[PDB]
Amino acid sequence: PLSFHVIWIASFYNHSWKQNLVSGWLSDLQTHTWDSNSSTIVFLWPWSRGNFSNEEWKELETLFRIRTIRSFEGIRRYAHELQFEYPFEIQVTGGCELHSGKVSGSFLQLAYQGSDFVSFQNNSWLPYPVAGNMAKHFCKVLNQNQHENDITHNLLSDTCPRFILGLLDAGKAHLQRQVKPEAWLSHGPSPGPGHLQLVCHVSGFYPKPVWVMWMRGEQEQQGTQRGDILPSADGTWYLRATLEVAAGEAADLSCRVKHSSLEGQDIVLYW
Amino acid sequence: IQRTPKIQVYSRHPAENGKSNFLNCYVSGFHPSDIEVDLLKNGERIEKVEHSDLSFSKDWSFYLLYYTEFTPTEKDEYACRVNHVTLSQPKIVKWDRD
Ligand SMILES: *[C@@H]1O[C@H](CO[C@@H]2O[C@@H](C)[C@@H](O)[C@@H](O)[C@@H]2O)[C@@H](O[C@@H]2O[C@H](CO)[C@@H](O)[C@H](O)[C@H]2NC(C)=O)[C@H](O)[C@H]1NC(C)=O
Numbered sequence A: 001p002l003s004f005h006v007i008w009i010a011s012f013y014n015h016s017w018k019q020n021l022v023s024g025w026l027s028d029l030q031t032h033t034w035d036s037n038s039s040t041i042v043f044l045w046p047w048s049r050g051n052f053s054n055e056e057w058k059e060l061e062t063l064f065r066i067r068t069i070r071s072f073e074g075i076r077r078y079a080h081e082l083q084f085e086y087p088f089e090i091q092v093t094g095g096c097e098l099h100s101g102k103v104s105g106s107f108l109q110l111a112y113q114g115s116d117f118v119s120f121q122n123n124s125w126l127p128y129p130v131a132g133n134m135a136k137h138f139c140k141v142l143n144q145n146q147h148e149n150d151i152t153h154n155l156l157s158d159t160c161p162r163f164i165l166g167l168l169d170a171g172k173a174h175l176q177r178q179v180k181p182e183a184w185l186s187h188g189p190s191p192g193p194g195h196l197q198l199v200c201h202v203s204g205f206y207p208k209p210v211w212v213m214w215m216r217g218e219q220e221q222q223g224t225q226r227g228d229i230l231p232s233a234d235g236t237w238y239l240r241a242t243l244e245v246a247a248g249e250a251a252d253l254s255c256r257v258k259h260s261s262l263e264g265q266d267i268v269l270y271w
Numbered sequence B: 001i002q003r004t005p006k007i008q009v010y011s012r013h014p015a016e017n018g019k020s021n022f023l024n025c026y027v028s029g030f031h032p033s034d035i036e037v038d039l040l041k042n043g044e045r046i047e048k049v050e051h052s053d054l055s056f057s058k059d060w061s062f063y064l065l066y067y068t069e070f071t072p073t074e075k076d077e078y079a080c081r082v083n084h085v086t087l088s089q090p091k092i093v094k095w096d097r098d
Helices: A054-082 A133-144 A146-170
Strands: A003-012 A019-026 A029-035 A040-043 A088-099 A102-112 A115-121 A124-127 A182-187 A195-205 A211-216 A237-246 A254-258 A267-270 B006-011 B021-030 B035-041 B062-070 B078-084 B091-094
Touching: A003 A054, A003 A146, A019 A054, A040 A054, A054 A133, A088 A146, A102 A146, A115 A133, A115 A146, A124 A133, A133 A146, A182 A254, A182 A267, A195 A211, A195 A254, A211 A237, B006 B078, B006 B091, B021 B035, B021 B078, B035 B062
Parallel strands: none
Antiparallel strands: A003 A019, A003 A088, A019 A029, A029 A040, A088 A102, A102 A115, A115 A124, A182 A195, A195 A237, A211 A254, A254 A267, B006 B021, B021 B062, B035 B078, B078 B091
């Protein structure tokens, strides 16, 4: 599925109070931040430059300088008429993606109070059906400046596809790396008298695709429930897989783990 | 819309009393973004805890990671306390190795 996108978070706590934050992401992994105190882009990894020159990054910096202030200052003055009420939040995401190693499409979507509001498609701003009349007015306003729309369209159409192929090949050795999990077993909460809950933790793995199952010999236990895959501060992943059993029938149980790092040798723990 | 937070606590490595480790607190699915997160040792705050940059999912809801070094002990109690406008009072989630 892999995509690249830039996000923008603006909040209008008070009349006296407001925050805004801009950053770039390659799926889950952060790669860029905008640093207002000095007014520059911040590369979080040495390969965050991709295949782009200083010349071009310089021009991209002029652009974000201008837009984030203008956009921010102008949503504040259009608020009274659009009937945005304090406090409120605005969110934007834009970028593009690849399906099987070729570019697939771009997007640019905007949200008000946690819900879809407007989107940018085929060189124009479009209103989201359930948002109603305030979303129509907002598009009326955003389409007036045809100049600024052609610039927005050239970022999504041309700059972004070149960027993501350059980013990915430059980050090759970090994204294609392989890291082996560890595993361990513990008691979970009892579902009721006469019964136990077995928990099996898997942690430290990269990449993300993993397989974990409770077993009786060769026979997979279909009561196995796996949870969410959760992040860990160093970049690797974490998971638990649980099973409820009558306590008389808990002998001869094991947890088995398969992952691309292990090179064929599955991890197996015995209860 | 307002959405209320989901709170998950976990350790990076299995507990071994007297050995350094990392305690995590993942807070996800909330809106709006205004939130207070703490990690507590014996119900008192922990200074210098670090967190990810604010980000959101495809359904617009926000998520954060909070984490810190810690050395678990036979008798020490560790938790995660969260406050959000969706909550009639602050919510605590204890870390239990079992
Ligand atoms: C940055 O990279 C892109 C992508 O090119 C491909 O992926 C690279 C990592 C590398 O493997 C190249 O050999 C690949 O071609 C460049 O854009 C492409 O340019 C080629 C010609 O060399 C062209 O045939 C493609 O259509 C281009 N793809 C586009 C425009 O999406 C680009 O030139 C590189 N540099 C910059 C600054 O953009």
